[PDB]
Amino acid sequence: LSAEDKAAVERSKMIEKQLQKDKQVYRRTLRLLLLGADNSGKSTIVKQMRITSGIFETKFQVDKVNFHMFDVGAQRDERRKWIQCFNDVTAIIFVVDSSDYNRLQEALNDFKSIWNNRWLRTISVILFLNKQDLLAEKVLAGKSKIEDYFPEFARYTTPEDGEDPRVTRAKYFIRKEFVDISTASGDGRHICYPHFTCSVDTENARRIFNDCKDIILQMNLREYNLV
Amino acid sequence: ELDQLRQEAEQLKNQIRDARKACADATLSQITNNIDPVGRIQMRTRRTLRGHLAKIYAMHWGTDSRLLVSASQDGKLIIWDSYTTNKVHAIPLRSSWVMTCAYAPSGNYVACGGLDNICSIYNLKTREGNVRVSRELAGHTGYLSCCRFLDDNQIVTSSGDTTCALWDIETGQQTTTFTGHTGDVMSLSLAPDTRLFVSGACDASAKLWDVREGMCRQTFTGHESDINAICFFPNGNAFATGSDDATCRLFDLRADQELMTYSHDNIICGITSVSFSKSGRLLLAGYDDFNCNVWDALKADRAGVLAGHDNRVSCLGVTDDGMAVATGSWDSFLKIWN
Amino acid sequence: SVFFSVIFMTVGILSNSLAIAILMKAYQRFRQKSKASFLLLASGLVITDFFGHLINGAIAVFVYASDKEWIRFDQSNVLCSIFGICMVFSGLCPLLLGSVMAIERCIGVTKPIFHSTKITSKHVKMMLSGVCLFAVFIALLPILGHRDYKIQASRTWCFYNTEDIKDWEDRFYLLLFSFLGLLALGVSLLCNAITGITLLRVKFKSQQHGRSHHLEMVIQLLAIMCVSCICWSPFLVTMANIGINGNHSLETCETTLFALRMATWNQILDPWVYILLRKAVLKNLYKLASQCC
Amino acid sequence: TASIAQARKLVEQLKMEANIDRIKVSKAAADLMAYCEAHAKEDPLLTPVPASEN
Amino acid sequence: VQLVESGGGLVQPGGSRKLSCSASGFAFSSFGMHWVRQAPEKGLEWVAYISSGSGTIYYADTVKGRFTISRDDPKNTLFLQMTSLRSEDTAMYYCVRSIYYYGSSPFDFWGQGTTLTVSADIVMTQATSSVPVTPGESVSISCRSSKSLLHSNGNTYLYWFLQRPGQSPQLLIYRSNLASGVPDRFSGSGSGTAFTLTISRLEAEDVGVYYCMQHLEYPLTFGAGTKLEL
Amino acid sequence: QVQLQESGGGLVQPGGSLRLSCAASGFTFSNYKMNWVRQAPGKGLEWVSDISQSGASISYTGSVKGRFTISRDNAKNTLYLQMNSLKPEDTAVYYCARCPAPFTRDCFDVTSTTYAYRGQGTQVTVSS
Ligand SMILES: O=C(O)CCC/C=C\C[C@@H]1[C@@H](/C=C/C(F)(F)COc2ccccc2)[C@H](O)C[C@@H]1O
């Protein structure tokens, strides 16, 4: 090996040390995905976190823990391709407008397609039922309800385990439908995380932190079990 | 009046179909029965390169069979040396969501891009020593899937917005634009003549475009699912395409029809990367079954299995001289086989 | 007596081989999802235990082959010293590594984000290197004190001087072994208990639907807290009693030999209870044995 | 109205593609076989090359 | 790229002096540094070499123990502390940058240097020292070494440096492989032992002294240098 | 080439019945999921129903839950959708979509706007 081979080996060792430092910095931070239809108010959720680019990154801090949330900025309606690149992330937050019933079926279909993915089957999904006040006002007005949209709502009752019982029954039925859709072909390797929030709720960061902590705990348990 | 144009297009499609079927006198299998079989070509891991902090997505060999460029989803372009195992360069990317990379034939520029919808070409022979952003061009409204170098001044880039364009490194503007496919473009493959290049998209269609004339000359719709891989034959007369149907199809430009369909009952995972050797007999296809398969271009028989990966085989590439073949998967390991 | 020794050696070799195989198979897959620090520490523990059991079995076979004539194959007192070092090492390694692993598991269960972001793989590697250096230093400590290991009354194993204890340094050493093992066992027990309590509290409060990975961990922790205690506590208690009383001990070397045998059963069963006694590992080994026969 | 323009462009593309000449399969197969037989001697993957050249 | 040296001058025998060198226009931490001396009316002579991050340091056998080279990456600076200066140490020192990889160009940029006045291995030798030639005729400079520089990998460790009166030595060929910034008129040929530098057209700015250097090992040894008068 | 020819449809009086057909050719019909999607004039693509490869897994939307009956035939490689009790809310274009990835439990973009594997769709209108 000449004097050049040793210099190349030293440069390779320096690059390896730099890559180790970059990997440590990458491990210190956590990554999250954000998905949702155009009708959903994900922009308000991004803007409230004050604690032609196809990708947008938002860096925030919760309990001295960094979080980088990545969201689609400018892409077409296709999702089957770029969804495989966002794998291995800590969690995925799917925003849904629970007020409008027309776009609810499309959101349910999208959630079912994302949950039953073959490559993303090892990543949990977080759901935030945004715009609860609008849904409450709409269901209390009496103009439109979930009866004409879903017949099962006519045979569903509130579980035994300042809000009117109508809104409670509606949100519990929505959560039950989401759980029944998620448990389908789940295999127990990843669980969903449903939560209720609005466009003014500031406690969403604590919920995201708790969900990420539970996901990391489940991953550590799966690692210890050698599944 | 849309019904008239619809029935006219249908009649034209039927005419093209019955004109192409008349040229199918015999299949390639009936002619390649007397030739001797290729046999089980056993391959061993000659080199193992580690250091990637994320999943390996794209790789490309330069003019020589020594240097190699690879991309990692952490925003890192690595320059590997297959002979000395030492890392040559490490380019930090501004966007980590990279999905493609290319090496110029002159060995001076390297392109990259992805979900950021911005194609960044960096210079490797910068007088200042450090890597500097040479040309960061934008304009596409979709994710970049593949990029290739035609010369030291022009570049071809694919995008998810179904519209491709030939970019100039000197000015950074679309020189020639094409019509586009029916779905998002997935992969490109240049011809050895550098004047034509065939592209495969999600519409199960492979279209051959020209550098001078911005239009498609032929169209192949033999597949049944999204085409994720494509590679042109060393002679420039045919090209193989791999889809998610666990089947590969060899379309010949001169014949303008499918000639060979590589498939197996036990194989169900889709094809991710396709590359040809210097002669073209060995076709190496990466599958999502954690293994790579070598097939014969004439006998269509399995010539070998590579199980040196523990995740989906995301990329593979054969050198220009056929000395070694690199394979990179999501396991952050780059295995260079004989 | 040599029959039991070679049987234990063979069983330990097979257990360590199976553990290394399963740990490599698990590391070839879990390295892409997590840090795989648990798998690396388990592999290192199994490797060092295998080497210790190999060295000890080879030395025991060499001794039994010479009809226990230490005056024949040992004139400069070189083999007995290495035997003692390789029996102060094996011991204190299988215990410090387990304590560090229990601490890491407790930190990951109580503070997952802290173990995932703050704790890196390089830190775990440096901790493992430091633990190995401390173990080999304590093993080389009697050699660096103008003394050496004395032949026990069993004439089959060299260790710290147990008979004719009149000075205070013999006492120090016997007592340091006993403590760097008692403190490690206590720390491991406390960490496992805290982890089990945390798992039970986080499971009893949640009623989503489950415990597919919590019950197995609780059973493993309980089995460890049982067997490690029942095995290592009598040996360390006997050693502490001999060190604090000297020659005034009541029982003979038979109790020491029984405690030694129970301890070598810790590290023959340690890879079993840590890797081989997992449901996935059990079914995989069963399928392999079925398809192989 | 953008559908009529797309339909006209598709019709024109099909008309321009229908004039492309095509040949038989036997000639292309023979050409590929000749190319493979000529380049077999220049393929270290097909013909095992000794370690002295690697 | 600029390499400004300072600290030279007159020094009494037995004293000490720290020659500073400020680098600009490039990544100082990426390139390895070389201190090379040149005696008045004589050839070149390598003194010391340091790598990136101070991980590998080498000195010439004649200056071992006396000189000490160091580099600071935060300030992008280089220093060479000298001890026990002798009467022979009067020379002009030059700081050169060199990066090592496949397709690189070591010793591509030579600094201005600074003057300092006081009071067995491979060696390169040249048979000819002065070649009078008209500016309309080709030039062929031959050279021979004592050991075959043809390594097992096949790389030829041969470097040519053209030093002009008043300017710094300029790199012409780093490996047959022509370097950057020089015309195509220069070419190199020969075997692992004998080497030949061919200049097709001799211009008015090509006059100077050509020095040969080998890089098979860390200890370097320059040749006598062939001067062209015109 | 993926061929999806649509048949049936038209103008139907309220309270009638229909039987829409979807002819799949050029691929193994028993290895792809088949979906029925609706498109209203001036609205977006809304998913209606879907059937898996083996015909065991079937699902419908809540708007017509229990009203329609979907079936598949691998021997003839044809999809059928029997619609009963049609209301004026069913005036829309029906599309027969296919999943691209075979042997998969599902696929993305089953109700996208522009899809290369979607037919022309039949216009089912109802008025009185
Ligand atoms: O019983 C006899 O007569 C022979 C004496 C046994 C000496 C070593 C036992 C060997 C075992 C290894 C044991 C060990 F793990 F190295 C010991 O660990 C420790 C226990 C406590 C104190 C320090 C060390 C092999 O598996 C088999 C071999 O018997």
Residue numbers in the entry:
A (entry chain A): 11 to 61, 181 to 290, 294 to 359
B (entry chain B): 8 to 345
C (entry chain R): 29 to 237, 240 to 323
D (entry chain G): 5 to 58
E (entry chain E): 1 to 119, 136 to 191, 193 to 247
F (entry chain N): 1 to 128
Q: Mind quoting what the paper says about this structure?
A:
Prostaglandin F2α (PGF2α), an endogenous arachidonic acid metabolite, regulates diverse physiological functions in many tissues and cell types through binding and activation of a G-protein-coupled receptor (GPCR), the PGF2α receptor (FP), which also is the primary therapeutic target for glaucoma and several other diseases. Upon agonist stimulation, FP is predominantly coupled to the Gq subtype of G proteins, which activation leads to subsequent PKC activation and a transient calcium signaling in response to the formation of inositol triphosphate. Here we present three cryo-EM structures of G protein-coupled FP in complex with its endogenous ligand PGF2α and with two synthetic agonists, LTPA and TFPA, at global resolutions of 2.67, 2.78, and 3.14 Å. FP folds into a canonical seven-transmembrane helical domain (TMD).
Tafluprost acid (TFPA), 15-deoxy-15,15-difluoro-16-phenoxy PGF2α, is the active metabolic form of TFP. TFPA is the most potent FP agonist (EC50: 0.4 nM) and has a fairly low potency to the other members of the prostanoid receptor family except for EP3 (EC50: 67 nM). LTPA and TFPA bond to FP in nearly identical binding poses as PGF2α did, displaying a similar “L”-shape configuration in these two solved structures. Likewise, the carboxylate groups of LTPA and TFPA form strong polar interactions with R2917.40, T184EL2, and Y922.65, the ethylene linkage in the α-chain forms a lone pair-π29 interaction with M1153.23, and the two hydroxy groups in the F ring form hydrogen bonds with S331.39 and T2947.43. Similar to LTPA, the phenyl group in the ω-chain of TFPA forms extensive hydrophobic interactions with FP. One fluoride group in TFPA forms hydrogen bonds to H812.54 and S1183.35, as the hydroxyl group in LTPA did. Notably, the other fluoride group forms a hydrogen bond with N842.57. This residue is highly diverse among prostanoid receptor family members. Consistent with this prediction, mutation of this residue to threonine does not significantly reduce ligand binding of TFPA, but mutating to alanine does. This hydrogen bond formed between T2.57 in EP3 and TFPA may contribute to the high affinity of TFPA toward EP3.
